[PDB]
Design a binder for these strands. Structure first.
Ligand SMILES: Nc1ncnc2c1ncn2[C@@H]1O[C@H](COP(=O)(O)OP(=O)(O)O)[C@@H](O)[C@H]1O
Ligand code: ALF
Ligand SMILES: [Mg+2]
Length: 422
DNA sequence: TTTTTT
């Protein structure tokens, strides 16, 4: 069962009427495991969300965007074009009106506009414009030393800097109206059988330069990616694409190319997957959409066992079952354009963003062009249970590590067990 | 740079 610190956080959150809680702690402390106990306690009263397909599946929930039907773009502060309440007799309206608890996992990855849009979407649907989250009890779980929210450099960064001052969930204006009670987990459950590896991760989290050189001497193994049962992580999509292409090319099976059908407007680069996707029998893949029948999920890893122009059979890693995947129609709505493609991507290599929240048997980090996101390295290192399960393509220099002053201000302030934005 | 999608 639950550890004594998970049990203490479980009781602190469930026994009080206080409507805003944050359960935070280092990687693998058992936050999502506590989230499963919270789901058994609240059952139907709670909706569980997470910012990524991976984190949502790990949390036995849904992405924030698929639940609220938010567009995959910047969500302007309380903007009616971006934040639309559901229809008068829709299944989403009923779900929002009846909800008592919102469980939000991997909150560190939740961008400020996404959290603010959740607040406003709840207040509008529930017709409670003066109550944060429309009276919904909010249980946030995550870690600000793991991946920072994704901020494209142009007009999105400007808008965020002008509206919130920064992109972090804790910079949301909702926190001026409600105090966030903070509960902590400290004990590594993922690395519990390797205590020196748990301590090395702790020193790396604290930016210790000696722990980095120790990590480099022990874990640098350029051939680490070629070993069976290893998942490769890369900072970039184009880096993962090159490593996936090489594995696909080595497979003996006849290739089959899947040309996406693009109709109407539908802008390039967005595009939820590649327009000309090549697959073979034996290819390692990741599923990009939840089955409307509930047999597979966005984030499911698997292997292609059969393939044809309009269908493929995928053996799932999660349950050892075969599922039949047909092309999916992504519709750009203002229904200006469509993008029809099989909702699959190659997955011998994935971005570090797609691994956050997972416990992996074996990981190899391919540095490529380098680290660009705060918490990116830390996420890659902390996916495994033991040091021997981790390998790096090259040594990492101390100059590659990132500092986020806004994260440090938040982390210092929550030491008091509360977050109250001025 | 990366995420969300429809
Ligand atoms: N109380 C516990 N007892 C045993 N194993 C646990 C416990 N809590 C977590 N774990 C395991 O440790 C790993 C990391 O837990 P997880 O909840 O995913 O951590 P986090 O969400 O904090 O990163 C998982 O393999 C999980 O099953
Ligand atoms: F904090 Al985690 F997997 F959710 F390390
Ligand atoms: Mg987790």
């Amino acid at each position: 069962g639950l550890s004594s610190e998970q049990q203490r956080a479980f009781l602190a959150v469930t026994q009080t009427p206080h409507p805003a809680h944050l359960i935070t702690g280092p990687a693998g402390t058992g936050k999502t495991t506590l989230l499963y106990a919270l789901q058994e306690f609240y059952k139907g009263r709670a909706v569980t969300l997470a910012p990524t397909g991976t984190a949502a599946l790990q949390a036995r929930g849904q992405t924030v965007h698929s639940f609220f039907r938010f567009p995959a773009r910047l969500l302007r502060y309380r903007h009616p074009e971006d934040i639309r309440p559901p229809g008068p007799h829709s299944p989403l309206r009923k779900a929002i009106e009846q909800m008592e608890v919102l469980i939000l996992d991997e909150v560190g990855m939740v961008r400020v506009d996404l959290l603010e849009a959740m607040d406003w979407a709840l207040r509008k649907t529930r017709k409670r414009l003066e109550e944060p989250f429309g009276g919904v009890k909010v249980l946030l779980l995550g870690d600000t030393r793991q991946l920072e929210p994704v901020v494209p450099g142009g007009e999105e960064a400007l808008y965020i800097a002008r509206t919130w001052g920064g992109p972090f969930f804790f910079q949301a204006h909702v926190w001026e109206e409600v105090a966030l009670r903070v509960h902590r987990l400290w004990e590594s459950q993922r690395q519990r059988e390797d205590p020196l590896f748990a301590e090395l991760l702790k020193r790396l989290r604290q930016g210790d330069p000696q722990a980095l050189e120790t990590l480099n001497r022990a874990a640098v193994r350029p051939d680490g990616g070629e070993e069976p049962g290893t998942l490769i992580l890369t900072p970039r999509r184009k880096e993962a694409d090159a490593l996936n292409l090489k594995r696909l090319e080595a497979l003996p099976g006849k290739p089959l190319e899947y040309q996406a059908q693009v109709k109407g407007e539908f802008a390039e680069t967005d595009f939820p997957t590649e327009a000309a996707l090549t697959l073979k029998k034996g290819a390692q893949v990741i599923l990009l959409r939840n089955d409307p029948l509930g047999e597979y999920f966005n984030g499911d890893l698997g292997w292609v066992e059969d393939l044809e122009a309009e269908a493929l059979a995928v053996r799932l890693k999660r349950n050892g079952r075969r599922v039949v995947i047909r092309p999916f129609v992504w519709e750009k709505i203002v229904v200006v354009g469509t993008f029809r493609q099989v909702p699959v991507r190659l997955a011998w290599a994935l971005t570090v963003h797609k691994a956050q929240g997972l416990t992996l048997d074996k990981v190899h980090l391919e540095l490529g062009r380098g680290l660009f996101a705060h918490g990116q390295l830390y996420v890659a290192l902390t996916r495994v249970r033991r040091l021997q399960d981790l390998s790096l393509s090259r040594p990492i220099a101390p100059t590659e590590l990132l500092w986020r002053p806004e994260v440090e201000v938040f982390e210092t302030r929550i030491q008091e067990g509360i977050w109250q934005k001025s």
